[PDB]
């Protein structure tokens, strides 16, 4: 019980850190996409 | 004295102490032959100031000249020559200069003569405020359309944007008295969201795929729904999703043949 419980605590910690890291990566991808979309729309308007 | 090009041009260096003392700036511009006037006049090509005063605010109101940062002066010093004006120094700028910029520059820091490197593009993006104005569905759809228009969806890390795979992690519908603790459904959700796919728990008309867990002994309902539903679903083996971890590689189109 002690072995599986602290391994499950480690599993919970790794799940949390993986979730937050993936969320940070997704947020960076999303805001980079937003900024690129804004500049691309600016350039599209300039081209038009 | 050194750069005579700054002669015949008036410079209203009426402030500037945070970076360098104003007398030092005056001495340097005199060494470059800049006209040091203590107050703006309708012959000064640009007004130079540091901290922003009521005089600068009035010039903003009474649009007479441009409030150029001392950093542009530092750029001129390090270049030892004239530095073209960029839309990052002038806090306030005359409408004529606004038209001049708009005629040959974008509304942002991007310029047609000086390209922006990684750091410059990062600064341009950061200067543009970031907020939420587009819905996630619309923004994802536009991203997918632009990526398909120029073949950007072929990135090996994000291919599940279009494939909204539904994971039937719930045996029953609308029952909050149960919670699957210690299950690998969270692992499957993380794997799906790694490539960009987002799972949904509410059934709607936008879901075009139904995927059940390891309990594949439910072929009877699939068989019954094949005759009923015209939307012929596609179900692959569970080894394919594990290939994203073991092989960690995409599957080529040559596998889809006769």
UniProtKB/Swiss-Prot annotation, chain A:
Implicated disorder: Short stature, microcephaly, and endocrine dysfunction: A disease characterized by short stature and microcephaly apparent at birth, progressive postnatal growth failure, and endocrine dysfunction. In affected adults endocrine features include hypergonadotropic hypogonadism, multinodular goiter, and diabetes mellitus. Variable features observed in some patients are progressive ataxia, and lymphopenia or borderline leukopenia.
Coiled-coil parts of chain: 1-21
Name by which UniProt lists this protein: DNA repair protein XRCC4
Post-translational modification: Phosphorylations by PRKDC at the C-terminus of XRCC4 and NHEJ1/XLF are highly redundant and regulate ability of the XRCC4-NHEJ1/XLF subcomplex to bridge DNA. Phosphorylation by PRKDC does not prevent interaction with NHEJ1/XLF but disrupts ability to bridge DNA and promotes detachment from DNA.
Localization of this protein: Nucleus; Chromosome
Family, per entry: Belongs to the XRCC4-XLF family. XRCC4 subfamily.
Tissue: Widely expressed.
Domain of life: Eukaryota
UniProtKB/Swiss-Prot annotation, chain B:
Annotated compartments: Nucleus
Coiled coil (residue ranges): none
Tissue: Testis, thymus, prostate and heart.
Annotated phenotype, changing residue 121 to P: Found in a patient with microcephalic primordial dwarfism; uncertain significance
Domain of life: Eukaryota
Domain BRCT: 1-90, 155-258
Annotated disorder: LIG4 syndrome: Characterized by immunodeficiency and developmental and growth delay. Patients display unusual facial features, microcephaly, growth and/or developmental delay, pancytopenia, and various skin abnormalities. Severe combined immunodeficiency autosomal recessive T-cell-negative/B-cell-negative/NK-cell-positive with sensitivity to ionizing radiation: A form of severe combined immunodeficiency, a genetically and clinically heterogeneous group of rare congenital disorders characterized by impairment of both humoral and cell-mediated immunity, leukopenia, and low or absent antibody levels. Patients present in infancy with recurrent, persistent infections by opportunistic organisms.
Family under the similarity heading: Belongs to the ATP-dependent DNA ligase family.
Protein task: DNA ligase involved in DNA non-homologous end joining (NHEJ); required for double-strand break (DSB) repair and V(D)J recombination. Catalyzes the NHEJ ligation step of the broken DNA during DSB repair by resealing the DNA breaks after the gap filling is completed. Joins single-strand breaks in a double-stranded polydeoxynucleotide in an ATP-dependent reaction. LIG4 is mechanistically flexible: it can ligate nicks as well as compatible DNA overhangs alone, while in the presence of XRCC4, it can ligate ends with 2-nucleotides (nt) microhomology and 1-nt gaps.
Oligomeric form and interacting partners: Interacts with XRCC4; the LIG4-XRCC4 subcomplex has a 1:2 stoichiometry and XRCC4 is required for LIG4 stability. Component of the core long-range non-homologous end joining (NHEJ) complex (also named DNA-PK complex) composed of PRKDC, LIG4, XRCC4, XRCC6/Ku70, XRCC5/Ku86 and NHEJ1/XLF. Additional component of the NHEJ complex includes PAXX. Following autophosphorylation, PRKDC dissociates from DNA, leading to formation of the short-range NHEJ complex, composed of LIG4, XRCC4, XRCC6/Ku70, XRCC5/Ku86 and NHEJ1/XLF. Interacts with DCLRE1C; the interaction is direct. Interacts with APLF.
Name of the protein in question: DNA ligase 4
Organism: Homo sapiens (Human)
Organism phylogeny: Eukaryota, Metazoa, Chordata, Craniata, Vertebrata
Protein encoded by which gene: LIG4
Parent-protein start and end of this portion: 654 to 911 of 911
